[model samples]
Target chain A: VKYTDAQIQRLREYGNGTYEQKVFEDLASRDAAFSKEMSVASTDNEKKIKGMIANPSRHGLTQLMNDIADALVAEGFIEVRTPIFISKDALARMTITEDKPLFKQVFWIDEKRALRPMLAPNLYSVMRDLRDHTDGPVKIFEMGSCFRKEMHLEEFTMLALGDMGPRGDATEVLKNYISVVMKAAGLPDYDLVQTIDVEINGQEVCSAAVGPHDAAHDVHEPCSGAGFGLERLLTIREKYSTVKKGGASISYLNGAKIN
Target chain B: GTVKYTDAQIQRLREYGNGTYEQKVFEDLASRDAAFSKEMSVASTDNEKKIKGMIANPSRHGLTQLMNDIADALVAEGFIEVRTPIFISKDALARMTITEDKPLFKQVFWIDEKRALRPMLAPNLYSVMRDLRDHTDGPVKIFEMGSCFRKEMHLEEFTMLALGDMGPRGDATEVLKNYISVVMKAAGLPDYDLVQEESDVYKETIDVEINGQEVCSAAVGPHYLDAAHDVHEPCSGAGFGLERLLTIREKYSTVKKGGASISYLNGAKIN
Candidate 1:
């Protein structure tokens, strides 16, 4: 299909795409499922995830999360599998690290008794397992589905596997771990490159190292981690496939109220 | 509306939001704490990498290949894997039958509510048997590992390996005895003996294996889990106590990565 005169004029006046096109190769139709029907009318979260899964890029998003998590594990960091549904003391560990009120905003559930909105405190509780039973500087990581308040971008409702950081360091070396794994999956690395911009809920974040002397301790004061915005990565990839000269063109999807 | 009234409320919410965001940041900043401890913990960096490579799917996938291996063993000896959800209402677990004050409960984590953290994953498997109303099949084979919660004790950790196979209207003891060889071979140990129970009638036989005159043992639950609806036969499993596996694997592999570890055995137990 093509654009009508009115819409075309709007594109021309808006310069096709500025926010996205400025940052991308083209603009595209808004993801259709990122609409009111598929997204609205549900706070159950799982239903929202179904709609979010409609994006073509979700596949790569999952792959990326796994790549990073497993890479840490493969690098000889200890591999520990912890529980997702934790207890008061366990879940409470998150409280010490998070703002309680803000958590209520993102948490979508209640046990009808007790449910927690974050992972840190409970993780701290798990960290004890290693501390009390073993010895010294352990490197364990977990990558799993975490839930939060159902807020959809593109004005749709959805759920996501947020690398919501704890991605303190997302790197080429991490990508190398992925290459080894990709080979395990019958796929190998390409000279191909992926541009990564870490962010959280539309706000940009960083993926730099915590530094050597900074190392790790029982805690990270003021905390440093990585946050990724999946939709931007996907839409960008979509544009890259076509826009040779690079563009403020229609090849990708996010264009703010341009003019 | 993301904001609230009272000048302090906005400050509180912003503080709250930032605090909420940093928890994961620290965990990653430190890594999740996978490390090596003790001796016999060797794994080739390649194998170490293999285990990490598969951890991406989080739960079921890591268990998938292991399940296939176990399933192949069980199927050869006769068995199958049935999936089960980790969550059930409070009444569901409270509806459970008990032996000795619920056999030393421990807290994992809460689900939608605090009261929902079940101490036992087996209850779900038990419910599945009853969900079928008992007359559906003669011999049922099933297994699972997922979110489980408990109180009375506070502990949280990851990656659990489990399995269960049951026979109904049959000699429960015989069914248990019959699979001894199957289980031993599957776990890479076939010569171990069920020992230590002669001292007391109620005490289960402690798991013991003999190599020359030396002994190595682990006592786990046998295949008889009594649940609310049915007397599930052979519902037994052993957890690797992940930290132990890492310690042992590290001793064998010689890797120094350590983020999580119990300072001593008292810090963590087989339970």
Candidate 2:
């Protein structure tokens, strides 16, 4: 299926995507009925978000997040907050600055410290800290903005979940957690594609893996988790064409222009 | 609808607000010039009682409850939450007309010469607004709440919430006004005032105040609108001080006492 260049650009616009993602975006866009549904969905989602705002008690996204928090708590997930800033040495250990071809975007804190590009640095430290508390399996999660220069994402609130200990069941656990979150987000028709990068219809919304990765310290034990963009979930739920429409902005609220 | 404490309370807090666990009690009695200070330790005991009550429940210590409450109110009104980079580039700051000798500049904590932890969310919000426009042509409504760094007390970080709108000029201002109203009402703030103020960043800023202390500041702009986002639309926005709002809500004498940090929980010293 062929898509208009306009559609191709849109697929490229939101999220840090690659050539493979474009194929999925192209496929979705060329479907006339799906495109129409997206337009209608976008408009309808806006109406619902607006209605939620007026309803006062509901508080739209916040309420959904709270609901998610409650469910996670019930499911025995421990919530934690980590510093939004990380040191440069932390990135070096992860081999990002060294192995990856990237320069120009990382914000520095000083000669030695720079804002953490992801929560992984802290997770690495915290995972070690978790060792001090428990000897085996521990389920923990955190949500905060990770500063990264993703051609598109300058910063995003990433909800990352992990289970560390002896169990190496990464994909299955990842599936369960994603389901739990999507339900909380009030998003329907959510699906999980099995692999390293969490993609749906081609958009890379999360990155998950189940052990045998040398990126953040040697995972001697089985560790599995994924970091997903909350705004991406909101975008999909509302049928918005771009992630920014549901992302953090100074200009929009509940998808409505402030004015 | 932020609350304001008595000048007497503010004056009293200056003596004990940042005191240590024992220092709070020691200083509480030591402040009065009474010769019976040693015997009048009841005041210290009473203070401890109130402090203990707050620490007993940790929810208020983070202002998580309060933040969630207001966020809910705002989000319900159709505002989407955004968490922009706390680490901001110098280019982004300068685009807002920030220069050396400016108040924000002196307080900036530079990661390097080229970047610093964002002192305020407005510049980043401006950037976010501009970035967002490349995608959405419809009204863009976004909001963010997070810790902003500043070279102040203990090199402290402040928590703030800001709402931004880019669309019709008339609609932006009104939407911001209503959004402000919704947040204040939800936060249980008393009636407040929005005083017009001048700024280089914004064409007109609406400062939301209660009992003479500014709790939040708002503005409408074509300045950043034209310079950065490449869109010429009147933009209206508001930045709320979470600590200040909490101070008012908790009737704490000083802003420091309202902090959710264990050090300032309900203005009592526990650690």
Candidate 3:
């Protein structure tokens, strides 16, 4: 069937099937009424987009982080921000050496510095210092971008929370923290699998651990913490197929496909 | 009764804490920084030497330096520098015939259904040139260099320097070649090859290659897509990848080293 360039484009954007010749033939009708319907549909879509532009919406990731921050603050967990770049020595303290698999995935800036792949290294550093000065429990949380090599996103946001001093069992403390985060994210269903992973719908979205363990950076006190991929959490919460949709991206804003 | 630090206070100390409690942390970081500087000063690799040179000279990053040079060349050639929004509407891409079925569509980083991070400068450039041709005088020459996103590279963000000329010109191909030569010269490349190529958007496409790798792509337009943008004049445009140019110039193993990366500054490892 003969199709105008505009007609072809409309069909391509809205059509259900692939670009195969047979699929195009099966989906697109060569009728005046169909053309008119397509035109009307295109106008309606444009109008909706214009309205959305006029009345913008909050980015899902940002909104979630704000809610989580509010929750953490109310629960006496102080929010923290640290450098995006961490030294190799810091990663080494986390036991991510040249022999470790995680070491290979690091986005190294030089022989000594690399974009932080996890918030734990910096969090551990903060915890160690805070514990030394503070008499009671030291509770802190950080939410920021972390870099890695394997994921679809080279940069992704991480929400890490740590609590030291007289925190009961590490696993139970982790569960309580996960519950707080889930409550903030409005996700009630999640499983603490293998005592370290937070899984939702069978997908692991966060990892937790206790300090006074061998790999920690001078963290000798009893402490429990967890790091969540904010994007992965949002992806599962919003039921998006891709984590890229939930992350900070120019492609998708606030979990809505822009282009 | 315990001293409780506010979140702000804790964050400040975590970042810039200098009190006795954080003395060890700061000292360790300081020693590491010193060691790194010493290592960079020794300059084992050529990349390290370049880093040392950058520290000594205090010049712009290599990518930025190349972009400035190219901008100077274009300005010298009477091309006015223009800046366009990185976010472009879907209609602009549609005007260039970049519909959903096209291969490039898959590479697009969409912001919403109707907007996206521009994958190329051409679509926005086309809109700007059309408006200029409508409002301005005789010839319209404009150039833009900024980040363009795509899924094909190690880093999704890259620098694209595009120049468009819509005015009186004898031969479009010759004009295109002249502009390429101007840019290459400014980029300090004495040689390059303009091989015939095909493109989904432009007709009579030429790929500018150095050391057998494509560094830039140029095409003379007045094609079928021109009517969509309401342009009737003869126009020629070329887009150069700044990272590709630097990679070829510096003989870097990958374009990532030559790109706008925190990893390397001016083709030098920031050790």
Candidate 4:
């Protein structure tokens, strides 16, 4: 989730804005430190890590995101883009409403309407629509901004591949998605973090789930997917500390000052 | 303007109506509208899938596919993607001279007295750049592609893809030119021109026009984004309407045919 000036101010009013900024700042510094260390470091792994980090000529984040999405498309997955605004009814289905953990974080557009706090809401409708329209298990996914008051902790890029294939084990299905995405990003290392969440450089970014879940409009069929933070992937690949300060725009770019 | 039946609707008609009578009625309903008959006559490919008992029809896939393609090209040319919030603060707009009585003020989709869906990406982008400018040393190349909001009678969201270069003014301009060339080439637009356009925000802009529509615009700074001019350094950027580009690329006469509507599927009448 990207912060608007209004959200940033509200966050600051609650003493959370600067903290997020600080986190990004710290991450940027860490990124700079890693770049510096890699430029002069003496180690096999360090040199390899530095190789990805110190490449000022290539835009790693965008390349990685495009690569990941392209790989999915090549795998017969149809890429879909859906509206990010969630209706009140949709939010209710997901159990996100007044007084909920995510309720307060929402950027409400009206009393009954608001910006989507996550990609899961629309995935449900897309899945149903594609299910009714497509012939085979509908393979589709969308990558875009998911909102939250505390988005400082979440990631972007969500996927929902068709009905579970012959693989009855939903866990393996979820891993396959993660594995492909990691491979596309050319990421060298990450931990499964107990199944469901993936951690790179000790920060959580990727999260996956299996079917019969309430999140995606309560699909009974074999459905499993995950959300991967493109920025986090770049951060880990480049040895940056946080997403905001990595190859991500706020943190670092082609030598521009991000005071 | 048109009536189109879905597979479910057609099946319902067949199940409920008396044999040939139902089919005749369906034909009458479809033929009553001129656009409907035209749609029925248009032959297009159905990218169907044979798995999971699902069916594939025409789709709203053109613009998205175009956006992805453009994104790939931009990334290959060295531009990182960034997403900023859509909600813009009143103060942020005021900084950019977008106060009341301005053209932008009336078109805003306000969320509250102090917040509204952002009309453009410059506000938040500028803020981020200010924070980053102090820390980084050279040129920063970044782009953001997503829906931007404006007051419209029907829908407010429009997809925009923008790329910016921040550094020496001339260098930024150079960067913008390079990116635009790359984008146009990737779009495979045989003929397009960058015409001078006036903007109260950019003070001046180079607008790219094709098929009589301004599909993209490029501007240089110290521009409106830095009206404060705090980061007196040069900044240049361009924003392309994803649908507009696709419309031109696919030879669609209007934005609607380029997948602007959820109803139209790849120029097919699926509504």
TM-score of each: 0.40, 0.58, 0.45, 0.68
DockQ of 4: 0.17
- Tens-digit lDDT track for model 4 on A71-156? 77766666555566678878888888677988887777766777777777676566555555433566666666666655264334
Candidate 4 lDDT over residue span B180-269, tens digit each: 888888878757887888887777898988856798888887444655746677777788887777766665433554443323334333
- Give per-residue CA lDDT, model 3, range A140-180, as digits (tens): 77776676767256667889888878766667777888899
lDDT per residue as tens, model 3, B104-181: 888887655787768899887777666555434466777777777775624567779998888746777788888899
Q: Could you say which candidate leads in TM-score?
A: 4
Off by over 4 Å in 1: A1-102, A105-171, A174-259, B1-78, B82-86, B98-114, B130-138, B146-162, B168-170, B189-227, B230-271
Q: What is the C-alpha lDDT of each candidate?
A: 0.34, 0.61, 0.67, 0.60
TM-score of 3: 0.45
What is the CAPRI rating of model 1's predicted complex? incorrect
Better of 2 and 3 by DockQ: 2
Model 4 lDDT vs. the true structure? 0.60
> Could you tell me which 10 consecutive residues in candidate 2 chain B have the lowest summed lDDT?
B18-27
Error of 4 at A255 (Å): 11
Alpha-carbon runs more than 4 Å astray in model 4:
A1-58, A151-169, A186-204, A213-220, A247-251, A254-257, B1-38, B41-89, B109-116, B124-143, B153-155, B164-182, B193-205, B220-227, B231-236, B252-271
Q: How high is the lDDT of residue B253 in model 1?
A: 15
Please give the range of 10 consecutive residues that has the lowest summed lDDT in model 3 chain A: A15-24
What are the candidates' individual DockQ scores? 0.02, 0.12, 0.01, 0.17
